[PDB]
Amino acid sequence: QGSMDALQLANSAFAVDLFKQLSEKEPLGNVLFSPIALSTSLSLAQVGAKGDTANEIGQVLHFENVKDVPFGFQTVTSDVNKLSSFYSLKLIKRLYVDKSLNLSTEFISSTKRPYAKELETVDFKDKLEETKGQINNSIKDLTDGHFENILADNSVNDQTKILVVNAAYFVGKWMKKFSESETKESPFRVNKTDTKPVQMMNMEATFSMGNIDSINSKIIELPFQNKHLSMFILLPKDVEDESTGLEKIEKQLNSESLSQWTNPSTMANAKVKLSIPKFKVEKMIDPKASLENLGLKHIFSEDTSDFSGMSETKGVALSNVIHKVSLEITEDGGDSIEVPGARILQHKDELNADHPFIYIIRHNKTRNIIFFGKFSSP
């Protein structure tokens, strides 16, 4: 539990850095990815890789001092999977390897338990065809039909060695539901003056929250049914800059601060006048580029990648990396008991997220970020 927590920090640290990278590519667009599924996949990778490839990951993922990493993930993973039967969520991390890569049995057993069915071996060469049909279909069933073809046209070919595919979806069911009769069409500020119609959900209930005068914002925790997962929305008090309004946050945002900003043991409840937009967000991404900028250079290089402890088949590197994520937020949730009269014996703040905001969906038990994203507009 000691190191099985130093890991969450490492993950949340990486989770941030990658966030910023993707934030620069779609500076005026939304962002959405599951840092956790990515950490896990590259975690499994680092097991087989050696030398520099093994130390390049240890850093970019911040495992510099996290003992028993595969166990850490073993837990988080079984946790999130148990949660899949209850929630309408799925999080598939699968790393495919071609037969041509005769995998050391040491490595295969060394990751049999920590990474359940997260390591599959197929034939990309003499069978690229059936393979992409078994995969496309495989994933299409594990994601309960949300992800039809996780594969594109040139995503993969006859020359694919190692393929990391991360498909994840989650249809949110709140702890405290929103009334459909209360959802209403209204503008959403995309900048200081421009707005785009949207479906704002409204409710006045008790939620914990606080103010971060440092970046002039409001933070709030909207727990999902049974508090297993909670969504922390970080909304600035007002749009003060030439773009989205998160310019200052994204600047002052870092591993350390994110922890500070979304600390639930620093925000007291309040009768909030909550209004958040209803939204479905699907985003596929090739983090390859972003990762490079972070430190991963050798892992993709077929001429530098050192995967000794996996397959002695020299001249093999991480081919592609797929990562589709789909987050749907609606009114659905459970019923909730609202304290007697919190309008007088409790603060009566308000959170109108009608402008750009950042949000993270944290797994409360481990404190891991399952979904990290920015909502710049519809």
Q: Roughly what angle, to the nearest 10 degrees, separates helices 35-48 and 69-86?
A: 140
Fold matches, 1-172+279-330 and 173-278+331-378: no
Q: What is the dihedral of CA 103, 106, 111, 117, to 10 degrees?
A: 40
Of 194, 123, 162, nearest to 322 by C-alpha is 162
What is the SS3 assignment for 254? Answer: coil
Q: In whole angstroms, what is the distance from residue 175 CA to residue 140 CA?
A: 29
User: Are the beta carbons of 72 and 1 closer than 8 angstroms?
Assistant: no
Q: In whole angstroms, what is the distance from residue 332 CA to residue 225 CA?
A: 10
Of 119, 198, 167, nearest to 323 by C-alpha is 167
Of 56, 49, 63, 57, nearest to 3 by C-alpha is 63
Domain boundaries, the chain: 1-172+279-330, 173-278+331-378
Backbone angles phi, psi at 73, to 5 degrees: -70, -35
Residue type, 123: D
Residues 6+ apart with CB under 8 A from 141: none
Determination approach: X-ray
Count Cα atoms within 13 angstroms, Cβ side, for 149: 9
Of 21, 17, 93, nearest to 62 by C-alpha is 17
| Residue 318 burial (CB count, 10 A) | 25
What is the SS3 assignment for 281? Answer: strand
Q: What is the dihedral of CA 310, 316, 317, 320, to 10 degrees?
A: -110
Backbone angles phi, psi at 71, to 5 degrees: -70, -50
DSSP 335: -
Q: In whole angstroms, what is the distance from residue 132 CA to residue 158 CA?
A: 11
Give bridge partners of residue 359 from the DSSP assignment: 233, 373
| Residue 172 burial (CB count, 10 A) | 21
DSSP conformation letters of 133-174: HHHHHHHHHHTTTS-S-S--SSSS-TT--EEEEEEEEEEEEE
Give the CATH number of domain 173-278+331-378. Answer: 2.30.39.10
| Residue 184 burial (CB count, 10 A) | 11
Tokens of 31: 């962002």
What is the SS3 assignment for 312? Answer: coil
Residues 6+ apart with CB under 8 A from 34: 91, 166, 168, 323, 325, 370, 371, 372
| H or E element at residue 273 | strand 269-277
Kindly give the pairing relationship between strand 217-223 and strand 229-236: antiparallel
Resolution in A: 3.1
Give the CATH number of domain 1-172+279-330. Answer: 3.30.497.10
Longest dimension (CA), the chain: 72
Residues 6+ apart with CB under 8 A from 83: 89, 228, 229, 363
Backbone angles phi, psi at 118, to 5 degrees: -85, 0
Give bridge partners of residue 322 from the DSSP assignment: 165
Q: In whole angstroms, what is the distance from residue 69 CA to residue 4 CA?
A: 8
Handedness of CA 104, 109, 112, 117 (dihedral sign): positive
